[PDB]
Design a protein around this ligand. Structure first.
Ligand code: ADP
Ligand code: MG
Length: 307
C-alpha cells in the first residue's frame, strides 16, 4: 500500500549511481561507496535483498530500517538520503563515512588510545541522548556500528535492530554486547534506552581490548554468562581511573543503577579536556597505517583510502 510505496523513490537507481566499490557486508547484501553521476556527490549505498526463502523477514527488516532512518536528524546519527527499489533489492542511501571504529581496530591491531576512546564515546553519547529523548533505542551499539566521517565526526549507524518505542521487549542485539535485562526479558519483559548504555560500556572494552568480553564462547554460552555472572571490567590497570569508573557505571547490571545517556554526558571521562585534533589525528594515523599494510591486509582495508 501507499504506506509502503511512500518509503521509496520511484526512479531507477542503477543509472543514478556510478563507481560502486564494496565497503561492508551483512546478511542482507553489501554496502558500497558510490558517486551520483549528476551531482558528483559521494554516498554510501546499503543494498538489501529480499529475494528467496527469507523474503518475508528480509522485507520486514528493510521496512523497519527505512522507517527508522526516516525519522532521524542529528549530527551524530548517520545522515539518511532516502531509499530506492529495484529487482528485490532496496538501495538505502546514506552519507559516506571513512570506516567504523572496528575498522580502526583492525587496521592497527591494537587498542585505541584512551583519548580516542573518549572522543568516540562522547560523540556516540550525543547520538544516544538524542535517540532516547525521542523514545527510540538503537539496540546494536558496537564498534562496527559507530562510524567516522573522513573529517572526524562520529556517526551512529546500523539501525537494523532499533526500536521505535521505549520501553521495548524484543530479544534483539548482538549477543556479546547485549544488556542483561534484554536477555532476562525473553521477548516479553521490558527494557529501555539504558540497554544502549550497557552496550556502550561493552564497546568501550572492545576499543580498549580489541574484542568484547566472552568472545571465546558461542552466543548461547555468552547470553547465559551475561545474565548469570558479574559484569565485566577493563583488564588493564594502565587505564585512567576516570575511564575505569566510566565503564563500571555503564556495566551496572541493574538498569535502575545504570546512568542514562543524558547523565553519562556529564561524566568526567567524556567531560575531561582532550586535544582538539584527537579524531583528525586518529584518521590520519589510520590512513598512514593502511598505506603500510601488506597486500593481505590492504585488500581488506583499502576502503580507508577511497577519498
Ligand atoms: N554510511 C556508511 N558509510 C561507510 N561505511 C558504511 C556505512 N554504512 C555501513 N558501512 C560499512 O558497512 C558495514 C555494515 O553496514 P551495517 O549497516 O552495519 O550493516 P549490518 O546491518 O548488516 O551490520 C559497517 O560496519 C561499515 O563498515
Ligand atoms: Mg552493523
Amino acid at each position: 500500500d501507499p504506506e509502503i510505496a511512500d518509503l521509496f523513490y520511484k526512479d531507477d537507481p542503477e543509472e543514478l549511481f556510478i563507481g560502486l566499490h564494496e565497503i561492508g557486508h551483512g546478511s542482507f547484501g553489501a554496502v558500497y561507496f558510490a558517486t551520483n553521476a549528476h551531482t558528483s556527490e559521494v554516498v554510501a549505498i546499503k543494498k538489501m535483498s529480499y529475494s528467496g526463502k527469507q523474503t518475508h523477514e528480509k522485507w520486514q527488516d528493510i521496512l523497519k530500517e527505512v522507517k527508522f532512518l526516516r525519522q532521524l536528524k542529528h549530527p551524530n546519527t548517520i545522515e539518511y538520503k532516502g531509499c530506492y527499489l529495484k529487482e528485490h533489492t532496496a538501495w538505502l542511501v546514506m552519507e559516506y563515512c571513512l570506516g567504523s571504529a572496528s575498522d580502526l581496530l583492525e587496521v592497527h591491531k591494537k587498542p585505541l588510545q584512551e583519548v580516542e576512546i573518549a572522543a568516540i564515546t562522547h560523540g556516540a553519547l550525543h547520538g544516544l541522548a538524542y535517540l532516547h529523548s525521542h523514545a527510540l533505542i538503537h539496540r546494536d551499539i558496537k564498534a562496527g556500528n559507530i562510524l567516522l566521517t573522513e573529517p572526524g565526526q562520529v556517526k551512529l549507524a546500523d539501525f537494523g535492530s532499533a526500536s521505535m518505542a521505549s520501553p521495548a521487549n524484543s530479544f534483539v542485539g548482538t549477543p556479546y554486547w547485549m544488556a542483561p535485562e534484554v536477555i532476562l526479558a525473553m521477548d516479553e519483559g521490558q527494557y529501555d534506552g539504558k540497554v544502549d548504555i550497557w552496550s556502550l560500556g561493552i564497546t568501550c572494552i572492545e576499543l580498549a581490548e580489541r574484542k568484547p568480553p566472552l568472545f571465546n564462547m558461542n552466543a548461547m554460552s555468552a547470553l547465559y554468562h551475561i545474565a548469570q555472572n558479574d559484569s565485566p571490567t577493563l583488564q588493564s590497570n594502565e587505564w585512567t581511573d576516570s575511564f575505569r569508573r566510566f565503564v563500571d557505571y555503564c556495566l551496572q547490571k541493574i538498569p535502575q543503577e545504570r546512568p542514562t545517556s543524558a547523565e553519562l554526558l556529564r561524566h568526567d571521562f567524556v567531560r575531561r579536556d582532550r586535544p582538539l585534533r584527537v579524531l583528525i589525528d586518529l584518521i590520519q594515523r589510520t590512513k598512514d597505517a593502511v598505506r603500510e599494510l601488506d597486500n593481505l591486509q590492504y585488500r581488506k582495508m583499502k576502503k580507508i583510502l577511497f577519498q
